[PDB]
Protein backbone atom coordinates (compact mmCIF):
# COMPACT_ATOMS: atom_id res chain seq x y z
CA UNK A 1 0.00 0.00 0.00
CA UNK A 2 1.15 3.53 -0.89
CA UNK A 3 0.24 7.04 0.31
CA UNK A 4 1.74 9.96 -1.64
CA UNK A 5 3.29 13.25 -0.51
CA UNK A 6 1.24 16.46 -0.65
CA UNK A 7 4.05 18.97 0.00
CA UNK A 8 6.10 20.75 -2.68
CA UNK A 9 9.73 19.71 -3.20
CA UNK A 10 10.57 22.88 -5.14
CA UNK A 11 10.77 25.86 -2.75
CA UNK A 12 11.99 29.47 -2.66
CA UNK A 13 15.54 30.08 -1.41
CA UNK A 14 16.61 33.02 0.83
CA UNK A 15 18.04 34.66 -2.32
CA UNK A 16 14.69 34.26 -4.10
CA UNK A 17 15.38 31.40 -6.51
CA UNK A 18 13.60 28.08 -7.07
CA UNK A 19 16.49 25.70 -6.37
CA UNK A 20 15.07 22.53 -7.99
CA UNK A 21 14.42 24.27 -11.32
CA UNK A 22 17.94 25.77 -11.29
CA UNK A 23 19.38 22.25 -11.06
CA UNK A 24 16.89 20.97 -13.66
CA UNK A 25 18.32 23.58 -16.05
CA UNK A 26 21.73 22.06 -15.26
CA UNK A 27 20.50 18.59 -16.25
CA UNK A 28 19.58 19.74 -19.77
CA UNK A 29 22.88 21.66 -20.05
CA UNK A 30 24.80 18.39 -19.62
CA UNK A 31 22.64 16.56 -22.17
CA UNK A 32 22.96 15.93 -25.91
CA UNK A 33 23.14 19.04 -28.17
CA UNK A 34 19.97 19.98 -30.08
CA UNK A 35 19.19 22.81 -32.52
CA UNK A 36 16.11 24.33 -34.17
CA UNK A 37 15.88 26.86 -37.01
CA UNK A 38 12.87 28.61 -38.58
CA UNK A 39 13.28 29.61 -42.24
CA UNK A 40 9.86 31.03 -43.31
CA UNK A 41 9.59 28.17 -45.83
CA UNK A 42 9.79 25.58 -43.03
CA UNK A 43 11.28 24.52 -39.69
CA UNK A 44 14.22 22.17 -39.12
CA UNK A 45 15.01 20.25 -35.91
CA UNK A 46 18.29 18.37 -35.42
CA UNK A 47 19.75 16.54 -32.41
CA UNK A 48 22.82 14.52 -31.40
CA UNK A 49 22.01 10.81 -31.31
CA UNK A 50 25.18 9.12 -30.05
CA UNK A 51 24.73 5.38 -29.45
CA UNK A 52 28.37 4.87 -28.40
CA UNK A 53 28.48 1.05 -28.22
CA UNK A 54 27.46 0.23 -31.85
CA UNK A 55 25.52 -2.75 -30.40
CA UNK A 56 22.59 -0.35 -29.98
CA UNK A 57 19.91 -0.43 -32.68
CA UNK A 58 19.74 3.15 -33.98
CA UNK A 59 16.32 2.94 -35.68
CA UNK A 60 14.57 1.42 -32.63
CA UNK A 61 14.27 4.52 -30.40
CA UNK A 62 14.00 8.04 -31.84
CA UNK A 63 14.77 11.38 -30.23
CA UNK A 64 12.83 13.31 -32.88
CA UNK A 65 9.18 12.44 -32.23
CA UNK A 66 6.02 13.47 -34.13
CA UNK A 67 3.01 14.70 -32.12
CA UNK A 68 0.54 15.17 -34.98
CA UNK A 69 0.48 15.48 -38.79
CA UNK A 70 2.18 18.90 -38.60
CA UNK A 71 3.97 19.09 -35.23
CA UNK A 72 7.20 17.48 -33.97
CA UNK A 73 9.46 17.52 -30.90
CA UNK A 74 13.19 17.50 -30.10
CA UNK A 75 14.81 17.58 -26.64
CA UNK A 76 17.97 17.85 -24.55
CA UNK A 77 18.65 16.24 -21.16
CA UNK A 78 16.94 13.09 -19.87
CA UNK A 79 15.32 10.56 -22.22
CA UNK A 80 12.67 9.02 -19.89
CA UNK A 81 11.24 12.41 -18.83
CA UNK A 82 10.95 13.56 -22.46
CA UNK A 83 9.00 10.44 -23.46
CA UNK A 84 6.26 11.26 -20.92
CA UNK A 85 6.08 14.81 -22.33
CA UNK A 86 5.64 13.38 -25.85
CA UNK A 87 2.66 11.22 -24.80
CA UNK A 88 1.14 14.18 -22.97
CA UNK A 89 1.64 16.47 -25.99
CA UNK A 90 0.15 13.81 -28.29
CA UNK A 91 -2.86 13.46 -25.97
CA UNK A 92 -3.43 17.23 -25.70
CA UNK A 93 -3.28 17.55 -29.51
CA UNK A 94 -6.03 14.93 -29.85
CA UNK A 95 -8.23 16.50 -27.15
CA UNK A 96 -8.14 19.78 -29.10
CA UNK A 97 -9.04 17.98 -32.35
CA UNK A 98 -12.07 16.27 -30.77
CA UNK A 99 -13.54 19.60 -29.60
CA UNK A 100 -12.73 22.05 -32.41
CA UNK A 101 -12.27 19.65 -35.38
CA UNK A 102 -9.23 21.76 -36.36
CA UNK A 103 -5.53 20.77 -36.17
CA UNK A 104 -3.94 22.30 -33.05
CA UNK A 105 -1.92 25.53 -33.52
CA UNK A 106 1.76 25.24 -32.53
CA UNK A 107 1.58 28.10 -30.00
CA UNK A 108 -1.56 26.56 -28.46
CA UNK A 109 0.09 23.17 -27.93
CA UNK A 110 3.17 24.70 -26.26
CA UNK A 111 0.96 26.64 -23.81
CA UNK A 112 -0.78 23.40 -22.78
CA UNK A 113 2.46 21.39 -22.50
CA UNK A 114 4.16 24.18 -20.51
CA UNK A 115 1.23 24.12 -18.06
CA UNK A 116 2.03 20.45 -17.34
CA UNK A 117 5.70 21.40 -16.82
CA UNK A 118 4.59 24.17 -14.42
CA UNK A 119 2.41 21.67 -12.52
CA UNK A 120 5.41 19.49 -11.57
CA UNK A 121 7.21 22.50 -10.04
CA UNK A 122 4.35 23.14 -7.58
CA UNK A 123 2.54 19.80 -7.07
CA UNK A 124 3.14 17.59 -4.03
CA UNK A 125 5.96 15.03 -3.95
CA UNK A 126 7.21 15.52 -7.51
CA UNK A 127 10.38 16.94 -9.08
CA UNK A 128 10.45 19.18 -12.20
CA UNK A 129 11.28 17.78 -15.66
CA UNK A 130 14.97 17.71 -16.60
CA UNK A 131 14.10 18.38 -20.24
CA UNK A 132 14.04 21.47 -22.47
CA UNK A 133 11.67 21.05 -25.42
CA UNK A 134 11.90 22.21 -29.04
CA UNK A 135 8.45 22.42 -30.66
CA UNK A 136 8.07 22.95 -34.42
CA UNK A 137 4.85 23.39 -36.42
CA UNK A 138 3.04 24.72 -39.48
CA UNK A 139 -0.27 26.56 -39.32
CA UNK A 140 -1.97 29.67 -40.79
CA UNK A 141 0.64 29.76 -43.59
CA UNK A 142 3.45 30.37 -41.09
CA UNK A 143 6.17 28.14 -39.56
CA UNK A 144 6.71 28.12 -35.78
CA UNK A 145 9.58 27.37 -33.38
CA UNK A 146 9.21 27.29 -29.59
CA UNK A 147 11.25 26.45 -26.48
CA UNK A 148 9.78 24.97 -23.29
CA UNK A 149 12.09 24.87 -20.26
CA UNK A 150 11.84 22.93 -16.91
CA UNK A 151 10.22 25.95 -15.19
CA UNK A 152 7.21 26.10 -17.53
CA UNK A 153 8.08 29.24 -19.49
CA UNK A 154 8.00 29.39 -23.30
CA UNK A 155 9.97 31.44 -25.83
CA UNK A 156 9.52 31.90 -29.58
CA UNK A 157 12.79 31.49 -31.49
CA UNK A 158 14.17 32.06 -34.96
CA UNK A 159 17.21 29.88 -34.19
CA UNK A 160 18.32 28.36 -30.87
CA UNK A 161 20.69 25.75 -29.41
CA UNK A 162 20.43 23.29 -26.49
CA UNK A 163 22.48 20.72 -24.55
CA UNK A 164 26.26 20.91 -24.18
CA UNK A 165 27.95 24.04 -25.58
CA UNK A 166 24.59 25.75 -26.19
CA UNK A 167 26.18 29.16 -25.51
CA UNK A 168 28.75 28.35 -28.22
CA UNK A 169 25.88 27.25 -30.48
CA UNK A 170 23.79 30.38 -29.92
CA UNK A 171 26.77 32.62 -30.76
CA UNK A 172 27.44 30.52 -33.87
CA UNK A 173 23.77 30.65 -34.92
CA UNK A 174 23.40 34.46 -34.70
CA UNK A 175 26.37 34.81 -37.07
CA UNK A 176 24.93 32.19 -39.42
CA UNK A 177 21.20 33.04 -39.38
CA UNK A 178 19.60 35.11 -42.15
CA UNK A 179 16.11 36.40 -42.95
CA UNK A 180 14.35 34.51 -45.78
CA UNK A 181 16.47 31.35 -45.61
CA UNK A 182 15.44 28.30 -47.65
CA UNK A 183 14.25 25.11 -45.91
CA UNK A 184 16.96 23.03 -47.62
CA UNK A 185 19.55 25.67 -46.68
CA UNK A 186 18.22 25.60 -43.10
CA UNK A 187 19.06 21.88 -42.82
CA UNK A 188 22.64 22.69 -43.91
CA UNK A 189 23.25 25.22 -41.14
CA UNK A 190 21.46 23.02 -38.57
CA UNK A 191 23.68 20.00 -39.28
CA UNK A 192 26.73 22.31 -39.26
CA UNK A 193 26.02 24.03 -35.91
CA UNK A 194 25.63 20.56 -34.37
CA UNK A 195 29.07 19.64 -35.73
CA UNK A 196 30.55 22.50 -33.65
CA UNK A 197 30.40 20.22 -30.59
CA UNK A 198 30.51 16.58 -31.73
CA UNK A 199 34.19 15.45 -31.92
CA UNK A 200 33.52 11.94 -33.32
CA UNK A 201 32.91 12.21 -37.11
CA UNK A 202 29.25 12.42 -38.18
CA UNK A 203 27.51 9.44 -39.78
CA UNK A 204 23.83 9.02 -40.76
CA UNK A 205 23.48 6.93 -37.58
CA UNK A 206 25.09 9.57 -35.34
CA UNK A 207 22.48 12.35 -35.71
CA UNK A 208 18.72 12.59 -36.25
CA UNK A 209 16.95 15.38 -38.15
CA UNK A 210 13.26 16.18 -38.72
CA UNK A 211 11.69 18.78 -41.01
CA UNK A 212 8.32 20.57 -40.89
CA UNK A 213 6.64 22.46 -43.75
CA UNK A 214 3.37 23.02 -45.65
CA UNK A 215 3.10 19.28 -46.40
CA UNK A 216 3.54 18.47 -42.69
CA UNK A 217 6.09 17.14 -40.20
CA UNK A 218 8.14 14.03 -40.99
CA UNK A 219 11.43 12.46 -39.89
CA UNK A 220 14.13 12.42 -42.57
CA UNK A 221 15.34 8.99 -43.72
CA UNK A 222 19.03 7.95 -43.23
CA UNK A 223 19.35 8.13 -47.04
CA UNK A 224 18.30 11.81 -47.00
CA UNK A 225 20.66 12.50 -44.07
CA UNK A 226 23.58 10.85 -45.91
CA UNK A 227 23.14 13.23 -48.87
CA UNK A 228 23.25 16.36 -46.67
CA UNK A 229 25.97 14.96 -44.38
CA UNK A 230 28.86 14.64 -46.85
CA UNK A 231 29.80 18.31 -46.21
CA UNK A 232 27.63 19.49 -49.12
CA UNK A 233 24.22 18.26 -50.34
Amino acid sequence: AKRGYSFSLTTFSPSGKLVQIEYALAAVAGGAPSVGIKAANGVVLATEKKQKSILYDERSVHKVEPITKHIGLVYSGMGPDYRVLVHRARKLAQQYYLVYQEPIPTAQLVQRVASVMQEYTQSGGVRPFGVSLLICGWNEGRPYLFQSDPSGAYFAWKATAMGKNYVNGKTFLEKRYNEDLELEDAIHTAILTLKESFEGQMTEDNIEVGICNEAGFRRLTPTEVRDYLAAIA
Binding site: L98, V99, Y100, Q101, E102, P105, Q108, Q111
Partner: protein, 204 residues
Protein backbone atom coordinates in the same frame (compact mmCIF):
# COMPACT_ATOMS: atom_id res chain seq x y z
CA UNK B 1 -44.08 18.13 -27.58
CA UNK B 2 -41.19 19.73 -25.67
CA UNK B 3 -40.07 21.76 -28.72
CA UNK B 4 -43.60 23.09 -29.31
CA UNK B 5 -43.90 24.48 -25.76
CA UNK B 6 -42.41 27.91 -26.52
CA UNK B 7 -42.42 27.74 -30.33
CA UNK B 8 -40.07 29.73 -32.56
CA UNK B 9 -38.41 29.49 -35.97
CA UNK B 10 -34.86 30.22 -37.18
CA UNK B 11 -33.71 30.46 -40.81
CA UNK B 12 -30.33 30.97 -42.51
CA UNK B 13 -29.53 31.56 -46.19
CA UNK B 14 -26.51 31.81 -48.52
CA UNK B 15 -25.83 34.48 -51.15
CA UNK B 16 -22.88 35.55 -53.30
CA UNK B 17 -20.54 37.05 -50.68
CA UNK B 18 -23.16 37.60 -47.97
CA UNK B 19 -25.06 35.57 -45.37
CA UNK B 20 -28.57 36.26 -44.04
CA UNK B 21 -30.21 35.03 -40.82
CA UNK B 22 -33.87 35.48 -39.84
CA UNK B 23 -36.00 34.56 -36.82
CA UNK B 24 -39.46 35.24 -35.35
CA UNK B 25 -39.82 37.39 -32.22
CA UNK B 26 -42.68 35.67 -30.35
CA UNK B 27 -42.18 34.56 -26.75
CA UNK B 28 -45.17 32.61 -25.44
CA UNK B 29 -46.15 29.72 -23.18
CA UNK B 30 -48.11 27.05 -25.12
CA UNK B 31 -50.94 29.27 -26.42
CA UNK B 32 -50.61 32.53 -24.46
CA UNK B 33 -48.30 35.13 -26.00
CA UNK B 34 -46.14 36.93 -23.41
CA UNK B 35 -43.47 39.13 -25.07
CA UNK B 36 -43.30 40.76 -28.52
CA UNK B 37 -39.56 41.57 -28.34
CA UNK B 38 -37.61 38.35 -27.73
CA UNK B 39 -34.01 37.83 -28.86
CA UNK B 40 -33.15 34.55 -30.61
CA UNK B 41 -30.22 35.58 -32.83
CA UNK B 42 -26.99 36.26 -30.91
CA UNK B 43 -23.73 37.89 -32.12
CA UNK B 44 -20.57 35.75 -31.87
CA UNK B 45 -17.83 37.88 -33.44
CA UNK B 46 -18.76 40.89 -35.61
CA UNK B 47 -19.36 38.73 -38.70
CA UNK B 48 -20.77 35.51 -37.21
CA UNK B 49 -24.25 34.91 -35.75
CA UNK B 50 -26.13 32.04 -34.09
CA UNK B 51 -29.91 31.53 -34.07
CA UNK B 52 -31.47 29.25 -31.47
CA UNK B 53 -34.97 27.76 -31.66
CA UNK B 54 -36.77 25.50 -29.18
CA UNK B 55 -37.23 25.83 -25.42
CA UNK B 56 -36.84 29.46 -24.31
CA UNK B 57 -34.66 28.47 -21.33
CA UNK B 58 -32.25 26.38 -23.42
CA UNK B 59 -32.13 29.13 -26.07
CA UNK B 60 -30.80 31.55 -23.43
CA UNK B 61 -28.70 28.99 -21.50
CA UNK B 62 -26.76 27.69 -24.54
CA UNK B 63 -26.16 31.24 -25.86
CA UNK B 64 -24.71 32.28 -22.48
CA UNK B 65 -22.56 29.16 -22.04
CA UNK B 66 -21.33 29.39 -25.64
CA UNK B 67 -20.32 33.02 -25.03
CA UNK B 68 -18.56 31.72 -21.90
CA UNK B 69 -16.45 29.40 -24.07
CA UNK B 70 -16.16 31.91 -26.94
CA UNK B 71 -14.42 34.65 -24.94
CA UNK B 72 -11.97 32.19 -23.37
CA UNK B 73 -11.12 30.95 -26.88
CA UNK B 74 -10.54 34.51 -28.11
CA UNK B 75 -8.27 35.29 -25.13
CA UNK B 76 -6.18 32.10 -25.28
CA UNK B 77 -5.79 32.51 -29.05
CA UNK B 78 -4.95 35.89 -30.61
CA UNK B 79 -7.54 35.42 -33.36
CA UNK B 80 -11.28 35.72 -34.04
CA UNK B 81 -13.24 32.45 -34.16
CA UNK B 82 -13.84 30.56 -37.43
CA UNK B 83 -17.36 29.43 -38.49
CA UNK B 84 -16.16 25.79 -38.65
CA UNK B 85 -14.58 26.18 -35.21
CA UNK B 86 -17.80 27.55 -33.67
CA UNK B 87 -19.82 24.76 -35.34
CA UNK B 88 -17.67 22.17 -33.55
CA UNK B 89 -17.87 24.17 -30.30
CA UNK B 90 -21.69 24.03 -30.34
CA UNK B 91 -21.54 20.33 -31.29
CA UNK B 92 -19.25 19.64 -28.31
CA UNK B 93 -21.39 21.71 -25.92
CA UNK B 94 -24.61 19.87 -26.80
CA UNK B 95 -23.08 16.36 -26.79
CA UNK B 96 -21.75 16.82 -23.24
CA UNK B 97 -25.43 16.60 -22.29
CA UNK B 98 -26.15 13.45 -24.33
CA UNK B 99 -28.56 11.74 -21.89
CA UNK B 100 -30.22 15.02 -20.88
CA UNK B 101 -29.92 17.54 -23.72
CA UNK B 102 -30.82 21.20 -24.18
CA UNK B 103 -34.07 21.27 -26.16
CA UNK B 104 -32.82 23.70 -28.83
CA UNK B 105 -31.71 23.46 -32.47
CA UNK B 106 -28.86 25.94 -33.17
CA UNK B 107 -28.35 27.54 -36.59
CA UNK B 108 -25.06 29.31 -37.33
CA UNK B 109 -24.85 31.95 -40.07
CA UNK B 110 -21.89 34.20 -40.92
CA UNK B 111 -18.88 34.96 -43.10
CA UNK B 112 -15.45 33.38 -42.62
CA UNK B 113 -12.92 35.97 -41.35
CA UNK B 114 -9.87 36.72 -43.56
CA UNK B 115 -11.26 34.42 -46.30
CA UNK B 116 -14.64 36.20 -46.81
CA UNK B 117 -16.42 32.88 -47.55
CA UNK B 118 -20.11 32.31 -46.62
CA UNK B 119 -21.08 29.60 -44.09
CA UNK B 120 -24.36 28.07 -42.87
CA UNK B 121 -25.21 25.04 -40.71
CA UNK B 122 -27.83 23.60 -38.35
CA UNK B 123 -27.47 21.23 -35.39
CA UNK B 124 -29.55 18.67 -33.46
CA UNK B 125 -30.49 18.79 -29.76
CA UNK B 126 -27.61 16.37 -29.03
CA UNK B 127 -25.33 18.25 -31.45
CA UNK B 128 -25.17 16.88 -34.99
CA UNK B 129 -23.72 19.38 -37.49
CA UNK B 130 -24.63 19.45 -41.19
CA UNK B 131 -23.30 21.88 -43.82
CA UNK B 132 -25.34 23.09 -46.80
CA UNK B 133 -24.77 25.49 -49.71
CA UNK B 134 -28.39 26.70 -49.84
CA UNK B 135 -30.36 26.94 -46.56
CA UNK B 136 -30.80 25.56 -43.04
CA UNK B 137 -33.98 25.76 -40.93
CA UNK B 138 -35.00 24.91 -37.35
CA UNK B 139 -38.16 25.26 -35.26
CA UNK B 140 -41.80 24.21 -34.99
CA UNK B 141 -42.69 25.10 -38.59
CA UNK B 142 -39.69 23.30 -40.11
CA UNK B 143 -41.84 21.73 -42.86
CA UNK B 144 -43.39 25.12 -43.68
CA UNK B 145 -39.94 26.73 -43.98
CA UNK B 146 -38.65 23.94 -46.25
CA UNK B 147 -41.48 24.47 -48.76
CA UNK B 148 -40.69 28.17 -49.14
CA UNK B 149 -36.90 27.82 -49.34
CA UNK B 150 -37.04 25.07 -51.99
CA UNK B 151 -38.94 27.37 -54.36
CA UNK B 152 -37.52 30.85 -53.71
CA UNK B 153 -33.77 30.25 -53.28
CA UNK B 154 -31.30 30.91 -56.08
CA UNK B 155 -27.56 30.02 -56.40
CA UNK B 156 -25.88 33.46 -56.57
CA UNK B 157 -27.77 36.29 -54.85
CA UNK B 158 -26.76 39.85 -53.94
CA UNK B 159 -27.44 41.28 -50.41
CA UNK B 160 -30.63 43.04 -51.55
CA UNK B 161 -31.98 39.99 -53.41
CA UNK B 162 -31.07 37.67 -50.54
CA UNK B 163 -32.98 39.90 -48.09
CA UNK B 164 -36.19 39.72 -50.15
CA UNK B 165 -35.85 35.93 -50.43
CA UNK B 166 -35.29 35.17 -46.71
CA UNK B 167 -38.02 37.64 -45.65
CA UNK B 168 -40.73 36.09 -47.84
CA UNK B 169 -39.57 32.57 -46.94
CA UNK B 170 -40.05 33.41 -43.25
CA UNK B 171 -43.25 35.51 -43.32
CA UNK B 172 -45.34 33.01 -45.31
CA UNK B 173 -44.07 29.98 -43.36
CA UNK B 174 -44.61 31.76 -40.02
CA UNK B 175 -48.19 32.80 -40.94
CA UNK B 176 -49.12 29.11 -41.29
CA UNK B 177 -47.76 28.39 -37.80
CA UNK B 178 -49.78 29.20 -34.67
CA UNK B 179 -46.88 29.16 -32.17
CA UNK B 180 -44.64 31.44 -34.28
CA UNK B 181 -45.06 35.08 -35.30
CA UNK B 182 -45.33 38.60 -33.83
CA UNK B 183 -42.63 40.10 -36.09
CA UNK B 184 -39.58 38.80 -37.95
CA UNK B 185 -36.05 40.19 -37.49
CA UNK B 186 -33.48 39.75 -40.30
CA UNK B 187 -29.70 40.22 -40.07
CA UNK B 188 -27.98 40.67 -43.41
CA UNK B 189 -24.23 40.13 -42.98
CA UNK B 190 -21.79 41.66 -45.46
CA UNK B 191 -18.01 42.19 -45.44
CA UNK B 192 -18.52 45.95 -45.01
CA UNK B 193 -21.85 46.31 -43.16
CA UNK B 194 -24.53 44.57 -41.08
CA UNK B 195 -28.10 45.47 -42.02
CA UNK B 196 -30.80 44.78 -39.42
CA UNK B 197 -34.46 44.94 -40.43
CA UNK B 198 -37.67 44.26 -38.50
CA UNK B 199 -40.33 43.26 -41.03
CA UNK B 200 -44.03 44.16 -41.01
CA UNK B 201 -45.71 40.89 -40.05
CA UNK B 202 -49.13 39.68 -38.87
CA UNK B 203 -49.74 40.12 -35.13
CA UNK B 204 -52.11 37.18 -34.60
Amino acid sequence: SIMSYNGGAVMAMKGKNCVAIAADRRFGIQAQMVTTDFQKIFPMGDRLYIGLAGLATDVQTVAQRLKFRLNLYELKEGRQIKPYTLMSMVANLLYEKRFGPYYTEPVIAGLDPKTFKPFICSLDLIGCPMVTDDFVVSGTCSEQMYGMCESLWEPNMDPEHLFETISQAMLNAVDRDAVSGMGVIVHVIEKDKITTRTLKARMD
